[PDB]
Each structure stands twice: as structure tokens, then as C-alpha cells.
Coordinates of C-alpha atoms and ligand atoms in Angstrom, one line a residue:
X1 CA 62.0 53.4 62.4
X2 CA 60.4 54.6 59.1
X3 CA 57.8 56.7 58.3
X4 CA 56.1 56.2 55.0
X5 CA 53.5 58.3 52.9
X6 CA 52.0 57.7 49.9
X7 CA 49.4 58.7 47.4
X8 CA 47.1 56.9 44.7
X9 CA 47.7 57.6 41.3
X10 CA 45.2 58.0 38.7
X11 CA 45.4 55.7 35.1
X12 CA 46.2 56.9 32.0
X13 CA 46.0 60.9 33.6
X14 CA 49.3 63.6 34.1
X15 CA 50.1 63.6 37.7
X16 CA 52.9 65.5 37.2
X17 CA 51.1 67.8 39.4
X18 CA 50.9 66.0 42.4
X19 CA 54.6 65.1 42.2
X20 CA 55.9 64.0 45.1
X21 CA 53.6 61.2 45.1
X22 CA 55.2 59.7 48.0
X23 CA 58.0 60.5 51.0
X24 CA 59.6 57.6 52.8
X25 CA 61.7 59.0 56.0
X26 CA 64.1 57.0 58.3
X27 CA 64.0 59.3 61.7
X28 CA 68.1 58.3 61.9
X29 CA 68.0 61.4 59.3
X30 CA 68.1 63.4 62.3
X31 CA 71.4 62.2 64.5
X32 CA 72.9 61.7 61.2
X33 CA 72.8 62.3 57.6
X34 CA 71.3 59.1 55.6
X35 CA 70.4 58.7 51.6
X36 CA 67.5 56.8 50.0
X37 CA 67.7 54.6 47.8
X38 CA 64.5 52.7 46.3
X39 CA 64.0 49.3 43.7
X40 CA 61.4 47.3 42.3
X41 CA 58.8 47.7 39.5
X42 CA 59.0 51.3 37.4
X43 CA 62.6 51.5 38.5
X44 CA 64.7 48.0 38.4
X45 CA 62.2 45.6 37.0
X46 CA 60.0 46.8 33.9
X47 CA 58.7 48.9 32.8
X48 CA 61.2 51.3 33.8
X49 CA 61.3 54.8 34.1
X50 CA 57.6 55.1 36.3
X51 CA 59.5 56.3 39.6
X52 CA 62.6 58.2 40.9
X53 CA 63.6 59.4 44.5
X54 CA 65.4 62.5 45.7
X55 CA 68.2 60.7 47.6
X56 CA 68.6 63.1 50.4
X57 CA 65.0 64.3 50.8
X58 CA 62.8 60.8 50.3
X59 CA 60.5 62.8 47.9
X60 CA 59.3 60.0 45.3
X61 CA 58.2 61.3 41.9
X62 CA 56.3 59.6 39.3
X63 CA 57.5 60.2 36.1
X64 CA 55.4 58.1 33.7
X65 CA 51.2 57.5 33.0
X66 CA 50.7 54.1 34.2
X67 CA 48.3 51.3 33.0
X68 CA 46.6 49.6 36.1
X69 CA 45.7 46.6 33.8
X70 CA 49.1 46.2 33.0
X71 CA 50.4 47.4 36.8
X72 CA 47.4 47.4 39.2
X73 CA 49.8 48.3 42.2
X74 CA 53.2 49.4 42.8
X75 CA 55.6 47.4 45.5
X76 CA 58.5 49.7 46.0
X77 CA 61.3 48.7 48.0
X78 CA 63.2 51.3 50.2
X79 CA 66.4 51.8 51.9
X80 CA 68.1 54.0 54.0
X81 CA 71.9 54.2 54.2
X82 CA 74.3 55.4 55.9
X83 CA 76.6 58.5 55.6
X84 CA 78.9 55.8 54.5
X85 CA 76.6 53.4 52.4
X86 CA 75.7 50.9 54.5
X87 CA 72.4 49.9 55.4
X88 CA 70.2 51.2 58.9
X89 CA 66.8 50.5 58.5
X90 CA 65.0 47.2 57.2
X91 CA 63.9 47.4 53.6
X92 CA 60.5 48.5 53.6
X93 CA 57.5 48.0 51.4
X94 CA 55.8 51.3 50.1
X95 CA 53.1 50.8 48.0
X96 CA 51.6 53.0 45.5
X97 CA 47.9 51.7 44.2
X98 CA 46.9 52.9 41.1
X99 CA 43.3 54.2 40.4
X100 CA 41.0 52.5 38.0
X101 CA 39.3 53.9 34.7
X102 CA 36.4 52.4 32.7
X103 CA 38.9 52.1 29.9
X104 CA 38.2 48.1 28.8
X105 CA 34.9 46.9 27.6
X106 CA 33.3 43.6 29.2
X107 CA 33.6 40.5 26.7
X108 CA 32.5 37.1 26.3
X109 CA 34.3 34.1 26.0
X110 CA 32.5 32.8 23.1
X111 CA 30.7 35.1 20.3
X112 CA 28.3 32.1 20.4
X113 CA 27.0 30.2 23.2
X114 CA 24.6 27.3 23.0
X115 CA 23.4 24.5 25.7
X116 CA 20.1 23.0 26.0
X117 CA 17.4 21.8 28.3
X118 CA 14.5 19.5 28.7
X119 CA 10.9 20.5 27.3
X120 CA 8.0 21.3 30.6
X121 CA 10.9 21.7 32.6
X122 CA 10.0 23.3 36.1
X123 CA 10.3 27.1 36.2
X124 CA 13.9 29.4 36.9
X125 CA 15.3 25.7 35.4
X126 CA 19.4 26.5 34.7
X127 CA 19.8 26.7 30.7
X128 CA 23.6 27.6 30.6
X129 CA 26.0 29.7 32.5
X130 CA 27.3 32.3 29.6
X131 CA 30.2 34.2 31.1
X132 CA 32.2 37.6 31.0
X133 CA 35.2 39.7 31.9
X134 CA 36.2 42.8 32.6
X135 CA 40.1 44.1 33.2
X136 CA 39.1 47.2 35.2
X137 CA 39.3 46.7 39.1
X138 CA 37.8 43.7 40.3
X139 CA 35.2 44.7 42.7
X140 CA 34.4 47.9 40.9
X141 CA 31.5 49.5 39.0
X142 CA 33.9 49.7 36.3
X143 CA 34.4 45.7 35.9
X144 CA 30.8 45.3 37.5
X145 CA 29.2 43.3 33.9
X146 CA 25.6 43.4 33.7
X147 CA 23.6 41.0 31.3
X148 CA 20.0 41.6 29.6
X149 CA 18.3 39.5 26.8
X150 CA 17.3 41.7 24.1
X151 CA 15.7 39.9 21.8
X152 CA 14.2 36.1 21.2
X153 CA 14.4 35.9 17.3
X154 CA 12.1 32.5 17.8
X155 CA 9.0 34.2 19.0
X156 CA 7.0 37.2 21.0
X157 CA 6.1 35.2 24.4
X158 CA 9.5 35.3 26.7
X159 CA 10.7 31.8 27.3
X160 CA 14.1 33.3 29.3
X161 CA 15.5 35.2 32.3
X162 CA 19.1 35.7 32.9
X163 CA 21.1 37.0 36.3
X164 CA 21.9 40.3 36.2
X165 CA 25.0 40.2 37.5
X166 CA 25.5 36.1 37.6
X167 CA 24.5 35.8 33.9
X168 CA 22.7 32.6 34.8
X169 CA 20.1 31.7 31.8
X170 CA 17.4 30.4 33.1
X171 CA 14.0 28.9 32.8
X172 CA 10.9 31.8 32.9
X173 CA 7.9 28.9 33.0
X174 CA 6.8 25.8 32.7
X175 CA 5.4 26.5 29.3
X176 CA 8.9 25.3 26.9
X177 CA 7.2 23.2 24.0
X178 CA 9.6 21.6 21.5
X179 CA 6.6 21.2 19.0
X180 CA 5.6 24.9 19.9
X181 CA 9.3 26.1 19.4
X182 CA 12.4 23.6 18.9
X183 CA 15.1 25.8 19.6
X184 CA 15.7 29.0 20.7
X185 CA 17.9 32.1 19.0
X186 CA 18.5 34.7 21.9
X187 CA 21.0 37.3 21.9
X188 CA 22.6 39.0 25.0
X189 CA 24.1 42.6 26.1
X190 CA 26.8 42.6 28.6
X191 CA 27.8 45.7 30.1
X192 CA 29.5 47.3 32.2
X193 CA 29.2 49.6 34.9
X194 CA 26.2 47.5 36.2
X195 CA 24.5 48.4 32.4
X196 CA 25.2 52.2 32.4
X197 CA 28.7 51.8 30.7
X198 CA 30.3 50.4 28.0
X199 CA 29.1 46.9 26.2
X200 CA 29.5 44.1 24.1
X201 CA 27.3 41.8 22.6
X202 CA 26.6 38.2 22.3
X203 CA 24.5 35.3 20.8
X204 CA 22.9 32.5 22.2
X205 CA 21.1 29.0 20.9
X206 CA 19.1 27.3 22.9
X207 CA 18.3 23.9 21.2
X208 CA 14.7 22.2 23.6
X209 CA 15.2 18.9 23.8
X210 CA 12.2 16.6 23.4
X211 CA 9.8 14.4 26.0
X212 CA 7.0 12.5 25.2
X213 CA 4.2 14.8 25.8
X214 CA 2.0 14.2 23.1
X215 CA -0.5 11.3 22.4
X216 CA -0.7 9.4 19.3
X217 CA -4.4 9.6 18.2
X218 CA -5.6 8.3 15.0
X219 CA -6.1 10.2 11.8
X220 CA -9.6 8.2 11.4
X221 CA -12.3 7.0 14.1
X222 CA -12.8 3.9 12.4
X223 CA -11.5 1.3 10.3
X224 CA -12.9 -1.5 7.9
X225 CA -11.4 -3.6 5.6
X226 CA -13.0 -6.4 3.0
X227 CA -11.3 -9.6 2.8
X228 CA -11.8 -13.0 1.2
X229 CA -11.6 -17.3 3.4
X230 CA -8.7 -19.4 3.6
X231 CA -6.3 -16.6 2.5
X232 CA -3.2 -14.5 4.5
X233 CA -2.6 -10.7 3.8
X234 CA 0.8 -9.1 4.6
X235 CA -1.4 -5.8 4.5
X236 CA -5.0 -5.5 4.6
X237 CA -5.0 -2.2 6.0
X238 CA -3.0 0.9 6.8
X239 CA -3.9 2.7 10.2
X240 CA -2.5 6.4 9.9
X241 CA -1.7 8.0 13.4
X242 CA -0.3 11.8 13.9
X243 CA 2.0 12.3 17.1
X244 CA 3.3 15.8 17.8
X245 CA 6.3 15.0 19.5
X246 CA 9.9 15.0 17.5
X247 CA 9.7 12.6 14.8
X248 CA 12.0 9.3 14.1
X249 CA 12.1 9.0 18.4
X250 CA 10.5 6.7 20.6
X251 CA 8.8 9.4 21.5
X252 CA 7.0 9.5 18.8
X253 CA 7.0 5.9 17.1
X254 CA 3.9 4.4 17.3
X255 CA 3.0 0.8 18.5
X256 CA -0.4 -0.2 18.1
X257 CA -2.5 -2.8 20.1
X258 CA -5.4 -5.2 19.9
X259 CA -7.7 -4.2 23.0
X260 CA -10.7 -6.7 21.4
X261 CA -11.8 -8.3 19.1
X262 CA -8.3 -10.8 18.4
X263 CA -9.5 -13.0 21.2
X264 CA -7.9 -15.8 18.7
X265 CA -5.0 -14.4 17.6
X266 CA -6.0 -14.1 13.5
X267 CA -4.5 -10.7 13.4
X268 CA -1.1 -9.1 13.9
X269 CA 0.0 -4.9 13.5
X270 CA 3.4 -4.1 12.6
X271 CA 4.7 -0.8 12.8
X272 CA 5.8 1.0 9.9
X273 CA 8.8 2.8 11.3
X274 CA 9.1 5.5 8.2
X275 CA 5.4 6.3 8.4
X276 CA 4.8 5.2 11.6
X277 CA 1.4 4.1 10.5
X278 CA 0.1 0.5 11.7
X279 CA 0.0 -2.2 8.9
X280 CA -3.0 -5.0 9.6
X281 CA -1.9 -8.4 8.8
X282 CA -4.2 -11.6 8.6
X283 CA -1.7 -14.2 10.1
X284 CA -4.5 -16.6 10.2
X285 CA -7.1 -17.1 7.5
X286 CA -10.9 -17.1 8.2
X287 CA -13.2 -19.2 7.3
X288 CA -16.5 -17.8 6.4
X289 CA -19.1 -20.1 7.6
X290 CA -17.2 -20.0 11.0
X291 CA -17.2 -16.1 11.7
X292 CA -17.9 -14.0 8.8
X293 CA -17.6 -10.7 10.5
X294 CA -15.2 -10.4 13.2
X295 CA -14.9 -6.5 14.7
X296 CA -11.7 -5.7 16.5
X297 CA -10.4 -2.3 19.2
X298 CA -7.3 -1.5 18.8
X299 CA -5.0 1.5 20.7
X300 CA -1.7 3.5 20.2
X301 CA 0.8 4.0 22.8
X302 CA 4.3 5.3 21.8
X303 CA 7.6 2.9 22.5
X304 CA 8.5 5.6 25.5
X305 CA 6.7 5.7 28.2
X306 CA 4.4 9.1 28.9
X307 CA 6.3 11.8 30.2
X308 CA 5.4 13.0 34.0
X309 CA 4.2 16.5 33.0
X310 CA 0.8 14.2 31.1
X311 CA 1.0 10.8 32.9
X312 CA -2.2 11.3 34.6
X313 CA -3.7 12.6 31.6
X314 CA -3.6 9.3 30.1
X315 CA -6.7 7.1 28.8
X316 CA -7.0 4.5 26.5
X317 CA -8.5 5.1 22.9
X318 CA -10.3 1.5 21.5
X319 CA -10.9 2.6 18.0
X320 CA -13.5 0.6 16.1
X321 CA -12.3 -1.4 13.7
X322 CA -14.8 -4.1 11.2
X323 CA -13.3 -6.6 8.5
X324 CA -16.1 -7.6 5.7
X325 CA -15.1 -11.6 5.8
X326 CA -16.8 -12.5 2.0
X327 CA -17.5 -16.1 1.0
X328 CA -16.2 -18.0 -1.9
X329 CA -17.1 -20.9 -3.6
X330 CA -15.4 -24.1 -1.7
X331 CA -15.5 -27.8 -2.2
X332 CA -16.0 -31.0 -0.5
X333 CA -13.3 -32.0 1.7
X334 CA -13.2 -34.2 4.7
X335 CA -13.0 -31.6 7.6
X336 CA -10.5 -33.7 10.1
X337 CA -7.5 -34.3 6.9
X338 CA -7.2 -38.1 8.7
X339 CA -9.2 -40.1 11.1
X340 CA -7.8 -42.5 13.9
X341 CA -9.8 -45.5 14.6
X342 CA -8.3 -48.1 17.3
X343 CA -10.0 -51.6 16.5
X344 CA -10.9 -52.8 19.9
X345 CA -8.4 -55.5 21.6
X346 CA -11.2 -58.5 22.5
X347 CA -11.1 -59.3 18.6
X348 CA -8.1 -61.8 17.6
X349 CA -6.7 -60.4 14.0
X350 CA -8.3 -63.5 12.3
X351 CA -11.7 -62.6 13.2
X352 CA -11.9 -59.1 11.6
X353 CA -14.2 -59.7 9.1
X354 CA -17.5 -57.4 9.3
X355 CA -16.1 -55.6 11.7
X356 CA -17.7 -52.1 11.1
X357 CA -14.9 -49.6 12.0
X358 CA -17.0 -46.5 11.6
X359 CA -18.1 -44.1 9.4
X360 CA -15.7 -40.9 8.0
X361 CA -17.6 -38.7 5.6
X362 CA -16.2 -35.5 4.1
X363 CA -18.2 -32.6 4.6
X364 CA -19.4 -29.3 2.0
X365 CA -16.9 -26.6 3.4
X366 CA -20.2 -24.4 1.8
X367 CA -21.5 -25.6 5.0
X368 CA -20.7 -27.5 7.8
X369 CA -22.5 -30.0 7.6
X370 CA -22.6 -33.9 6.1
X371 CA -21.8 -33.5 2.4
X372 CA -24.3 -34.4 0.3
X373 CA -24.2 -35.6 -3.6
X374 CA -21.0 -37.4 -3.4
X375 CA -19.6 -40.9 -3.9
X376 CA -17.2 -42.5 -1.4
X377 CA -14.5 -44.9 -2.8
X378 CA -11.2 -46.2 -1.1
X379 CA -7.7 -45.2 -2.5
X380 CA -4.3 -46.7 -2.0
X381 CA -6.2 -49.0 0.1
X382 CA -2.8 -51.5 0.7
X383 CA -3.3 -55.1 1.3
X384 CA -7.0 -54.5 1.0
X385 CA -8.5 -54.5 4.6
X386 CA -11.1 -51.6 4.2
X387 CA -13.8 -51.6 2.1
X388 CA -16.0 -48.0 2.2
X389 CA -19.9 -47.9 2.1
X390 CA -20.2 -45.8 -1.4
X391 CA -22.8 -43.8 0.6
X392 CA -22.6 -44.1 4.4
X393 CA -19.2 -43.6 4.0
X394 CA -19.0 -46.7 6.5
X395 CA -15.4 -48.8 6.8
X396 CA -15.7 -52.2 7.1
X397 CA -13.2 -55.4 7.2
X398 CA -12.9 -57.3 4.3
X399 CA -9.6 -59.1 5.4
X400 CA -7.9 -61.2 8.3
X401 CA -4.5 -62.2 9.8
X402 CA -1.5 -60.7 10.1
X403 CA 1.4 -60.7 6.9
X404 CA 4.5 -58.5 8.4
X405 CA 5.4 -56.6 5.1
X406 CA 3.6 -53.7 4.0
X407 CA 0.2 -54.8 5.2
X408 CA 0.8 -53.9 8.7
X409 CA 3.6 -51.6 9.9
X410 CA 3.7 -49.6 13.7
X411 CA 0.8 -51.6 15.0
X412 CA -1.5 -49.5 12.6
X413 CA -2.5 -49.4 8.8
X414 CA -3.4 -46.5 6.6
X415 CA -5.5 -46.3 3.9
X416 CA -7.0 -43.2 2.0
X417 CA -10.4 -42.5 1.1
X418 CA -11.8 -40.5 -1.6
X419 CA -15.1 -38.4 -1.7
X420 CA -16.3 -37.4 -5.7
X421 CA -18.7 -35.2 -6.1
X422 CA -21.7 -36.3 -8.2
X423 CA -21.2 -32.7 -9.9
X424 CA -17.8 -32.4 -10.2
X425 CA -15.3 -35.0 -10.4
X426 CA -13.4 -32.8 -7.6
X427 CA -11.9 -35.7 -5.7
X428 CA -11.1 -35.1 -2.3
X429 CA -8.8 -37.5 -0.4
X430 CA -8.8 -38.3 3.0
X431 CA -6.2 -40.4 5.0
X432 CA -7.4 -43.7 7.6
X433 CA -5.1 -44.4 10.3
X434 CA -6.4 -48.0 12.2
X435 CA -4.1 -48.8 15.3
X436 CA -4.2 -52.4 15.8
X437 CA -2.7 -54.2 18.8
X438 CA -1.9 -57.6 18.0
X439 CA 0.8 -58.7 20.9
Ligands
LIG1 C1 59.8 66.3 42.1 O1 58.7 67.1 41.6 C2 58.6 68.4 42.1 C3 57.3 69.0 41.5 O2 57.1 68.6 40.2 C4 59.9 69.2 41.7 O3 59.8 70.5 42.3 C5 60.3 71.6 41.6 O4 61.7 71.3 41.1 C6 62.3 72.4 40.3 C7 63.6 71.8 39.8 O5 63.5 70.5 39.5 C8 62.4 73.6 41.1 O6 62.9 74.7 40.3 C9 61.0 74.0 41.7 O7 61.1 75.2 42.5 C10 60.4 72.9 42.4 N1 59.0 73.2 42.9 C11 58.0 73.6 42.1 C12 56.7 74.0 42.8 O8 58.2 73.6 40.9 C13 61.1 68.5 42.2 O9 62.3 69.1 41.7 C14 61.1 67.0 41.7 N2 62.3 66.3 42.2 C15 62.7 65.1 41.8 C16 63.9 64.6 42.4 O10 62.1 64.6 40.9
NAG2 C1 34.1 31.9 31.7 O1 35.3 32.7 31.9 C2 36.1 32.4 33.1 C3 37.2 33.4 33.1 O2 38.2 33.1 32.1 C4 36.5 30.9 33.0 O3 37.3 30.6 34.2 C5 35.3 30.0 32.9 O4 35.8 28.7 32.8 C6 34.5 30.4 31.7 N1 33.3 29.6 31.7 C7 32.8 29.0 30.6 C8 33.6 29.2 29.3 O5 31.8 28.3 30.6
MAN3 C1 -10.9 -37.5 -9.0 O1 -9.9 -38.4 -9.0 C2 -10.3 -39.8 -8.9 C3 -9.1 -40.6 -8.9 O2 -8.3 -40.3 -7.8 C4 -11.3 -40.1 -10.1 O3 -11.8 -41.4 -10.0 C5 -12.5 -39.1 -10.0 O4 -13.4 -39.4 -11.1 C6 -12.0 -37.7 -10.1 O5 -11.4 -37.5 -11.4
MAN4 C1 -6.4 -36.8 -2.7 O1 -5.2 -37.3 -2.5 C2 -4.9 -38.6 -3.1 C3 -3.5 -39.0 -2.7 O2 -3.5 -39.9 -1.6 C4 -5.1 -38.4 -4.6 O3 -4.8 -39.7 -5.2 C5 -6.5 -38.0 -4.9 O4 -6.7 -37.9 -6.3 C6 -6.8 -36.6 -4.2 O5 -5.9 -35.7 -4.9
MAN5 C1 -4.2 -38.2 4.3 O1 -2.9 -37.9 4.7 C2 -1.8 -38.4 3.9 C3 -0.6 -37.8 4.4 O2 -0.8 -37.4 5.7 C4 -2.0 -38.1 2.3 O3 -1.2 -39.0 1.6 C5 -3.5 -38.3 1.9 O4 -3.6 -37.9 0.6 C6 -4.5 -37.7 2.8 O5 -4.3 -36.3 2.7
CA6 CA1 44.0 50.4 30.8
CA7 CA1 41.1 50.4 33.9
CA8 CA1 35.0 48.2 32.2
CA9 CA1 4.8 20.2 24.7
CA10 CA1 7.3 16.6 22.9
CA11 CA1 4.2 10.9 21.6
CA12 CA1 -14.7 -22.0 4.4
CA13 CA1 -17.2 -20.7 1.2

């Protein structure tokens, strides 16, 4: 049976005063005479030269200051022998722990950490998890790292929190705003000895990401515009809009809307994305004597959707917006470009003659309304079936039977008629379809 002993050993110090630093005993020692005989680290393995033992005795001396980084513990293995060499007890394990000194400063992995998190995030949100390490004792005051943020370069209302001991960076409140502060610069102290000790430093850069938390709201409360009849505009206006989310993102591109007004479709937005301002198109021209003022809402909504932190928050705008529709000087034309009269089926197409197929009179497009001063003619009027009253603008049949070629062609025949005015020799044309079923 053996009887061990040991004492700790202090790191870096001269315990050449507490020599022996340990006594391993086999109580065979007393029948008969046995020598020690010890291995391991300090002795066999390296380092060497850290322990001997007095072979007769069992006093072990240390012989060398020790680094615990490098050698926390020491495992060394005992024997006791017999008078003649050979072994009488199993080998035992003495060990020898060495005591800790604050002689290594806490460190970070990186010089510069960086993560990032959403804007209005709830509070004691996680950022990153920055880490340390110390080589004194695990489980010690001297490897116990403690964080603290010591400055926020970005501004002068704290944003962060970090774990103490954890070195958790995390969310202080609710109140992140990208478009208050993108990013964030922060710069950490690790130390030791729960803060006490020694330290190193650290940086930290927080980039805040962005959410749509902002409305687009336009730079103007109204909107007019002055455009001419019968005419198409790529751009009649420019509607400017400031959003105060991160530019170039959905969250931030405006897309505009018609909420009145367009009831027939004459109008069209487009979106400038490099200025994200609203271009007004006319896809449909206007005519003045129809509608010469029409007044139109519009809206802005982002492509995103709102974010939750301002969902509620959320009404609709319907900014005013009036274009000035100005006349201009228009001729006679016939208002239908072709009319399609159907001859009735009781006549056969022998009997035609006087048969009044109706009247088709162009109209002043200065009004509405039948024009007036003009002469009506007939053009291109092939085989010569319609004759036009030169007033009336009245069709009659000046012609009977049925030739195949040319004259009549899908059961119809077309003629043109032409309206002069007595004040312009501006002749408009207009086209006379006349089905025909002749069986
Ligand atoms: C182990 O260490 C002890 C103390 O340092 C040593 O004890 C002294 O040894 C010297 C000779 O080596 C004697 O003259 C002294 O009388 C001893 N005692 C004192 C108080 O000094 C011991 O010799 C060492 N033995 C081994 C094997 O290392
Ligand atoms: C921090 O350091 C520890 C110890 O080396 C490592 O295991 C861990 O992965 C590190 N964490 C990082 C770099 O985020
Ligand atoms: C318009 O054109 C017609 C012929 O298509 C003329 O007769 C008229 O006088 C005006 O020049
Ligand atoms: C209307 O169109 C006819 C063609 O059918 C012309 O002849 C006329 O002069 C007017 O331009
Ligand atoms: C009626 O329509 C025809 C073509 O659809 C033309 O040739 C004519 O001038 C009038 O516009
Ligand atoms: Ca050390
Ligand atoms: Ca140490
Ligand atoms: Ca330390
Ligand atoms: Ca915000
Ligand atoms: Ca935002
Ligand atoms: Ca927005
Ligand atoms: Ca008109
Ligand atoms: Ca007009």
C-alpha cells in the first residue's frame, strides 16, 4: 500500500524553499529496504529537469519554475522496488497541480468584429456574439474576461448592451433607425479578472439593415398640368416624392396610383426608378368638346409592403391633381370614319332605284353637332350606285342589277363620300359600306 503527499506549486515563483514538494512511501519500506524510482513529465518526457526523487527516502524536489500554461498539472508516475530491483507496489499516480498567475491578458479573436441586425427590432435583440480568451486557469478570476462598451463613435443616445461575462451584443430598445443612424462604430474592453485586471481592446461595426418604415409622401399637395386635343404625351408631368428609407430598395421605390379621376383609362404613371419620381403620361388623347377638364387622385405606396412596426399607421393620401384640356382649331370630319347600311331583303336588286339608303353627314369636330357650310359629293363611287344629296347628305340608288366584277364583291359595296367645306376646300372623306343580300 502507498502513501502519497503532495503540495501545489506556485507559477513562475522559487519554491526552492518548500522543497520537498512531495513524499510517496510504500509501507513494505519497513519489513524490507525498497528504492523509488519516479517518470513522466519534468523527468522522462519534456521539459526535463522540473522533478527528482531521493531514492531511499521518497522526498520529491522540484528543481525548476514551471509555466502552468505550458504544464497546468503534473502526472508523476511512481515505483517502488525491491532490495533487488524488482517491482512491489502498482505504479501510482501522484499529482502535483500547479497554481495559477494573472500572467496572460484576455484577447479577441478578431481586432474587428462586425454583424448586423434588422432596424425597430424588439429590445435585448442578439447583434453578434464577439468572443475572448484567456490562458490562466479556466474557472478562475484570473481567466474570468469581462466586456464593457466604451464608446459609440455614431452618436450620444446608447443603442447597445453587451453580457458581462457572455459578451453577448445586444439590442438596448426598440428605437434602431437606419435613416437616424445606418451603422454603428462601437468599440469594446475585455478584461480580465471580472474588469479589475489586465485588458485588451477591440472594435466593433454594426451595419442596421433597412425595413420599410417610412411613407412616400409627395414633395407638392397638388398637381396641374396644361395640355392640348387629339395629342399623346410621353410626359406631361413629373410627380416628385421623398421616402426616408434606404435608397435604390423596394423599400423605398415609389409606385404611384390613380385613386380617381382615370375612370377611362386616358392616363398612365411610370416610375422613374433613378429619381423615383412619377412621370404622367396621356396614353389616350382628349378631345375638348367631350371633357375639357378632367381632375384626377392619385397615391404612393412603395413596391414592399409596410413594415409591422407602422402597418397600422397606414392611410391613403389622394393628392389632387387638374389637367387644363385647351382647344384647338379642328375641322369637319365625319365622326363614325364609315357607315354600314344593310338595304332591306323585300327589294329584288333590279328594283333599287330611289331607294333612299339614308343620310351620313360629317359633323364640325368644333362642336358636335351637324356640320354646317359644307358641300357633300361622292368619291370613288364604283359602278355608280349612290348618288349623295349635295346638302342632306342623303344616299340614294341610281343603279340596278347585279354585274359580279368590281360592282359588287362580299355581298356589300363601298363607296366614299366627301364633305368640302364652303370655307375651306378641306375635304374630308368618309367611307359607305352597303351589305346587300342577293341569294
Ligand atoms: C531536497 O531539498 C532539501 C531542501 O532544499 C534538501 O535538504 C538539504 O540538503 C542539503 C544537502 O543537499 C543538506 O546539507 C541540508 O542539511 C538539507 N536540509 C536543509 C534544511 O538545508 C535535500 O538535500 C534535497 N534532496 C534532494 C534529493 O534533492
Ligand atoms: C470564439 O473563440 C472560441 C475559442 O477559440 C471559438 O471556439 C469560437 O468559435 C469563436 N467564435 C467566433 C469566432 O465567433
Ligand atoms: C378637297 O379635295 C376634293 C377632291 O378630293 C376637291 O374637290 C375639293 O375642292 C378639295 O380640294
Ligand atoms: C379623304 O380620303 C379620300 C380617299 O378615299 C381622298 O380622295 C380625299 O381627298 C380625302 O383626303
Ligand atoms: C373610309 O375608309 C376607307 C378605308 O377604311 C378609306 O379609303 C376612305 O378614305 C375613308 O376613310
Ligand atoms: Ca504563464
Ligand atoms: Ca497563468
Ligand atoms: Ca488573465
Ligand atoms: Ca426608422
Ligand atoms: Ca427604414
Ligand atoms: Ca418607404
Ligand atoms: Ca375635338
Ligand atoms: Ca377643337
Amino acid at each position: 500500500e502507498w502513501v502519497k503527499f503532495a503540495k501545489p506549486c506556485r507559477e513562475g515563483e522559487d519554491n526552492s524553499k518548500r522543497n520537498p514538494i512531495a513524499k510517496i512511501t510504500s509501507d513494505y519500506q519497513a519489513t524490507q529496504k525498497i528504492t523509488y524510482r519516479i517518470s513522466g513529465v519534468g523527468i522522462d518526457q519534456p521539459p526535463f529537469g522540473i522533478f527528482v526523487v531521493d531514492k531511499n527516502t521518497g522526498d520529491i524536489n522540484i528543481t525548476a519554475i514551471v509555466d502552468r500554461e505550458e504544464t497546468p498539472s503534473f502526472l508523476i508516475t511512481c515505483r517502488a522496488l525491491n532490495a533487488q530491483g524488482l517491482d512491489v507496489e502498482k505504479p501510482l499516480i501522484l499529482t502535483v497541480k500547479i497554481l495559477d498567475i494573472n500572467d496572460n491578458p484576455p484577447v479577441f479573436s478578431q481586432q474587428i468584429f462586425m454583424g448586423e441586425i434588422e432596424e425597430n427590432s424588439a429590445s435585448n435583440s442578439l447583434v453578434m456574439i464577439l468572443n475572448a480568451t484567456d490562458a490562466d486557469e479556466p474557472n478562475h478570476l484570473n481567466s474570468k474576461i469581462a466586456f464593457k462598451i466604451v464608446s459609440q463613435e455614431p452618436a450620444g443616445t446608447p443603442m447597445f448592451l453587451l453580457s458581462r461575462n457572455t459578451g453577448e451584443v445586444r439590442t438596448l430598445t426598440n428605437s434602431l433607425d437606419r435613416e437616424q443612424a445606418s451603422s454603428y462604430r462601437l468599440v469594446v474592453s475585455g478584461a480580465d479578472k471580472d474588469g479589475e485586471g489586465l485588458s485588451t481592446q477591440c472594435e466593433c461595426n454594426i451595419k442596421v439593415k433597412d425595413v420599410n418604415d417610412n411613407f412616400p409622401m409627395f414633395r407638392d399637395s397638388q398637381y396641374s398640368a396644361r395640355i392640348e386635343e387629339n395629342i399623346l404625351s410621353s410626359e406631361l408631368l413629373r410627380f416628385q416624392v421623398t421616402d426616408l428609407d434606404e435608397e435604390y430598395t423596394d423599400n423605398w421605390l415609389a409606385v404611384y396610383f390613380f385613386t380617381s379621376g382615370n375612370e377611362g383609362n386616358w392616363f398612365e404613371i411610370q416610375t422613374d426608378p433613378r429619381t423615383n419620381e412619377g412621370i404622367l403620361k396621356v396614353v389616350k388623347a382628349l378631345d375638348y368638346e367631350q371633357l375639357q377638364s378632367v381632375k384626377l387622385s392619385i397615391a404612393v405606396k412603395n413596391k414592399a409592403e409596410f413594415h409591422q412596426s407602422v402597418i397600422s399607421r397606414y392611410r391613403v393620401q389622394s393628392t389632387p391633381v387638374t389637367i387644363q384640356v385647351i382647344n384647338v382649331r379642328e375641322g369637319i370630319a365625319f365622326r363614325p370614319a364609315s357607315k354600314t347600311f344593310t338595304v332591306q331583303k323585300g327589294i329584288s336588286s333590279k328594283k333599287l332605284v330611289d331607294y333612299i339608303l339614308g343620310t351620313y353627314q360629317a359633323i364640325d369636330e368644333d362642336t358636335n353637332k351637324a356640320a354646317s357650310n359644307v358641300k357633300y359629293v361622292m368619291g370613288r363611287n364604283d359602278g355608280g350606285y349612290l348618288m349623295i344629296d349635295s346638302k342632306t347628305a342623303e344616299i340614294k340608288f341610281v343603279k340596278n342589277m347585279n354585274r359580279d366584277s368590281t360592282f359588287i364583291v362580299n355581298k356589300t359595296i363601298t363607296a366614299e363620300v366627301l364633305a368640302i367645306d364652303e370655307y375651306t376646300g378641306k375635304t374630308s372623306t368618309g367611307t359607305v359600306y352597303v351589305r346587300v343580300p342577293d341569294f
